[PDB]
Nucleic acid binder design. Structure first.
Lengths: 48, 273, 148, 434
RNA sequence: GUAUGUAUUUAUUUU
RNA sequence: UUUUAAGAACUAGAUACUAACAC
RNA sequence: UUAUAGUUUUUUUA
């Protein structure tokens, strides 16, 4: 319990940020391979 | 509508599974019931042997030049596309009927008559469905694994226990991920979707075009095309068997990265335009 | 005035074909059939009035009068005729009295009732009046087929 | 302001006005002869006259058999009157409602005040320029009538108000509710089977919370479809009102919202039904349903709600599939009718049918799945679509009565840490009955 | 018991 | 030119965090 | 336990 406790220094807010940011990156990757597979159909859809 | 562009014979046994090069669209990898894999040009390029028994599933990697094939021999075999030789052999699966390659993590997801889903470090075992596991998929955000089993359920997994259970199916033999963040799940007579589709008995694979067209292969040989938004069925076709009326069915199917590729139980691949 | 014609035709029976319940072309016909069947039920109740709640008969007839006129003139909305016909259809099946009551429950809740053996509606005051009496036709029928 | 906003809701005010005065629409709806009554003619009341105090109008016009002698206006309890000053036929009441306060706790100055002023005022609507005032302060429960007088009503009023102010429920809704807020309540069986129709509402299946992953981590709450389970114990046609989670979409805590949509469904079903098929009672184990039921059950003092006196096992209803099979299939909420007893009215009376049925529910409550196997152990005789429980022979039903019975006794003695061998009969009958 | 935050593209921008 | 995971199967649950859900 | 419930120092008898 303690040996696990010491190792995280931040507090709820920072961790919350780590998540939010990664979720943004999943959004990016997804939207990309959206556009990639649409290029494999040749139809070119512009990014927002 | 759709129609029949091309017929490709050349497998000795049935065609169980088909996957397509995710980058250049230049070829197929097609399993077989003869244990081989024959890489077709979207002519026959090469033959990849090395399984002793039939190949239920094949999946090609995006970020990697790797090809993960999996069979009834209880083994998940890697393939290095560069030099075309088996690199790695997995394990834990005394037949494995599904492989799906997690997009961003360098993971494998395998499943089969084990009734468990194994996350392979290219680590986790997911206790789960009460029967064999037919079809498995991977997603970048939450639930990262969707699974479908012959207990007639579909589970949405949290890999880091079940996040959600979907019981509305009355065996779920096929799923496909819409390239909208949803899934299309199948059963005997009713093809549903999950974040309905009108079907009379079609009993008993699915594929989703980027145009929101939802393909459904029959075991009666009928090709049931749908719109994905509505649920409407705008077309139903019937394949010509070959030069038995029982052998007419559709084992697998896929779309490229405007064409359709369906391996059939008649020992032929057909290309629908 | 075709409704004035269908009502005078002796070629229409009380038997309801469930396959016609949702038909657009058969609406005028089905509407008259419902009118004819309800009269037939009230007729058998009349014939055995002393044996089955005679004190409720008159009130039931009065509540059904406006519905019958509407059925005779094909004035019921599509969804409403569909629900009523479904109830009456199952009622014509002795071993389907429970499917009739189930259909009746939907109708009373404002939902469309489709044949079960084989979305929404709105209810008014005078309409609520005849929907209530329909339940009386159901209870009578159960008693009738049970006591003979 | 908080506490009051409790005390009145769903227009409990308006309901009060109807219950009282409309119930007089009965009592002097039927009195024709002795007072020379042609008919009871009242104007259709706009919905706001109950809670809008701007100005008032003639309510319920008495149109005499023959003729009537209007004395100069006095109170109900203002006595001695010479009626013959005038004559009318058509009449009316002014009967109203105001919650008074420690300044004005005497209505009568308000009675004659408002009455007089109204009568002599333009905006006041009258068919007859004679009539009667009956007001009430719900505050101190006072009431009064300052009318013009043609003879004979006076005690009919007097005594009748003794009844009303002691009876017509909405009052007793207050005097319940005010005591809720005030927290003063002064300190110091088989008949279920009698003729009139007795119904069973049990709501524990109505809102089913479903625990699910919290995006980050936490314990997530949700729900999945319920339905309202009601039956009469006798004739076995189930009323299931489907609860389709769409219902809960946007709002609040759904504990209160549960209880209130249960009440409104049960009521709507009742109202819609015929006077012949309506219940004469209602019986529920969960008494959190009292207030919602009641408050929607003002409208029917005919019916009478009665609770449980006795410990009861109804929460297993869903674990017996086919109905739950129906719960999970519904796209849109609807009623469905079913069959409780399989067919138990041939081979039994409903009597020991219901004893065996409770016992079934029991062994479904404690150990569950052992009981479900007991039922379906040999499926090789199969349940039809209409039945629910596994169809049996005589002996199968009978011994399974014994075994299901046995569970809670044995599991009991083990689990509750008090022995089964030292028992006395009446505690056995207790847990069996409850 | 909640504030707070996020996305909600339908009507085809030239090879 | 890089790399190599001991592998597979079976098992119960204790300490856990939290729950606009049950006095 | 209801018509809620982050700041309004949260909780004691003759």
């Amino acid at each position: 319990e303690a040996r696990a406790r010491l190792l995280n220094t931040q507090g709820k807010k920072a961790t919350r940020k780590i998540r939010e940011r990664m979720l943004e990156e999943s959004k990016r990757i997804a939207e990309l391979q959206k556009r990639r597979e649409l290029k494999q159909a040749g139809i070119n859809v512009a990014i927002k | 509508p759709k129609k029949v562009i091309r017929n490709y014979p050349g497998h000795p046994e049935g065609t169980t599974a088909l996957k397509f090069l995710p980058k250049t669209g230049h070829l197929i990898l097609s399993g077989g019931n003869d244990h081989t894999i024959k890489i077709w040009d979207f002519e026959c390029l090469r033959d990849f042997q090395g399984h002793n028994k039939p190949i239920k599933a094949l999946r090609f990697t995006e970020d990697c030049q790797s090809f993960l094939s999996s069979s009834f021999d209880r083994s998940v075999k890697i393939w290095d596309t560069e030099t075309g030789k088996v690199k790695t052999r997995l394990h834990l699966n005394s037949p494995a009927d599904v492989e799906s390659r997690p997009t961003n993590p360098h993971e494998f997801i395998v499943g089969l008559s084990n009734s468990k889903i194994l996350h392979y470090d290219d680590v986790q075992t997911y206790d789960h469905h009460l029967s064999s596991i037919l079809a498995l998929k991977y997603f970048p955000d939450g639930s990262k694994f969707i699974s479908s089993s012959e207990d007639k359920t579909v589970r949405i997994w949290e890999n880091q226990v079940p996040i959600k259970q979907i019981s509305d199916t009355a065996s779920m033999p096929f799923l496909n991920v819409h390239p909208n963040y949803f899934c299309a799940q199948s059963m005997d007579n009713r093809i549903y979707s999950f974040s309905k589709y009108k079907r009379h008995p079609k009993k008993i694979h699915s594929s989703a075009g980027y145009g929101i067209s939802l393909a459904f292969s029959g075991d009666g040989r009928y090709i049931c095309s749908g719109d994905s938004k509505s649920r409407l069925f705008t077309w139903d076709w019937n394949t010509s068997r070959l030069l038995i009326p029982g052998n007419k069915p559709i084992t697998q199917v896929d779309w490229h990265p405007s064409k359709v590729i369906c391996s059939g139980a008649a020992g032929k691949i057909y290309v629908c335009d | 005035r075709i409704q004035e014609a269908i009502a005078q035709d002796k070629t229409i029976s009380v038997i309801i074909d469930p396959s016609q319940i949702g038909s657009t072309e058969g609406k005028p016909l089905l509407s008259m059939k419902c009118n004819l069947y309800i009269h037939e039920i009230l007729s058998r109740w009349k014939a055995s009035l002393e044996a089955y709640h005679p004190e409720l008969f008159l009130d039931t007839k009065k509540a059904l009068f406006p519905l019958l006129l509407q059925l005779r003139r094909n004035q019921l909305a599509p969804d409403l005729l569909i629900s009523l016909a479904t109830v009456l259809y199952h009622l014509q099946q002795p071993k389907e009295i429970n499917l009739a009551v189930q259909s009746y429950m939907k109708l009373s809740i404002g939902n469309v009732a489709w044949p079960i053996g084989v979305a929404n509606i709105m209810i008014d005051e005078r309409t609520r009046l005849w929907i209530t009496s329909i339940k009386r036709l159901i209870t009578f029928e159960e008693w009738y087929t049970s006591n003979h | 302001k908080i506490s009051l906003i409790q005390i009145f809701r769903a227009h409990l005010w308006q309901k009060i006005h109807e219950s009282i005065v409309f119930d007089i629409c009965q009592i002097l709806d039927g009195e024709l002869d002795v007072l020379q009554i042609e008919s009871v003619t009242k104007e259709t009341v706009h919905p706001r006259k109950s809670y809008k105090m701007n100005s008032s109008a003639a309510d319920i016009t008495m149109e005499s058999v023959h003729e009537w002698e209007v004395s100069k206006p006095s109170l109900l309890h203002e006595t001695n009157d010479s009626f013959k000053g005038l004559i009318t036929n058509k009449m009316w009441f002014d009967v109203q409602l105001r919650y008074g306060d420690y300044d004005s706790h005497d209505i009568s100055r308000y009675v004659r005040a408002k009455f007089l002023d109204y009568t002599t005022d333009n905006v006041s609507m009258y068919p007859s320029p004679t009539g009667v005032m009956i007001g009430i302060d719900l505050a101190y429960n006072m009431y009064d009538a300052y009318g013009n007088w043609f003879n004979g009503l006076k005690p009919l009023i007097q005594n009748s108000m003794r009844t009303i102010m002691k009876a017509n429920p909405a009052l007793y809704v207050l005097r319940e509710r005010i005591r809720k807020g005030l927290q003063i309540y002064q300190s110091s069986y088989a008949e279920l089977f009698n003729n009139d129709i007795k119904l069973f509402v049990d709501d524990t299946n109505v809102y089913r919370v479903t625990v699910h992953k919290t995006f980050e981590g936490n314990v997530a709450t949700k729900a999945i479809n319920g339905c309202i389970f009601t039956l009469n114990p006798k004739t076995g046609h189930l009323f299931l009102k489907i609860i389709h989670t769409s219902v809960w979409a946007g709002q609040k805590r759904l504990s209160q919202l549960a209880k209130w949509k249960t009440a409104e469904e049960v009521s709507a079903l009742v109202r819609s039904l015929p006077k012949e098929e309506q219940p004469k009672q209602i019986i529920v184990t969960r008494k959190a349903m009292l207030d919602p039921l009641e408050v929607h059950m003002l409208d029917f003092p005919n019916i009478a709600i009665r609770p449980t006196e006795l410990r009861l096992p109804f929460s297993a209803a869903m674990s017996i599939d086919k109905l739950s099979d129906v719960v999970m299939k519904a796209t849109e909420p609807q009623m469905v009718l079913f069959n409780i007893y399989d067919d138990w009215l041939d081979r039994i009376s409903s009597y020991t049918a219901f004893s065996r049925l409770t016992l079934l529910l029991r062994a479904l409550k404690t150990n569950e799945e052992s009981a479900k196997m007991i039922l379906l152990s040999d499926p090789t005789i199969t349940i039809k679509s209409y039945h629910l429980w596994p169809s049996f022979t005589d002996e199968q039903w009978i011994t399974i009565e014994s075994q299901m019975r046995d569970l809670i006794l044995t599991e009991y003695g083990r689990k509750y840490n008090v022995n089964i061998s030292a028992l006395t009969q009446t505690e056995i009958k207790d847990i069996i009955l409850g």
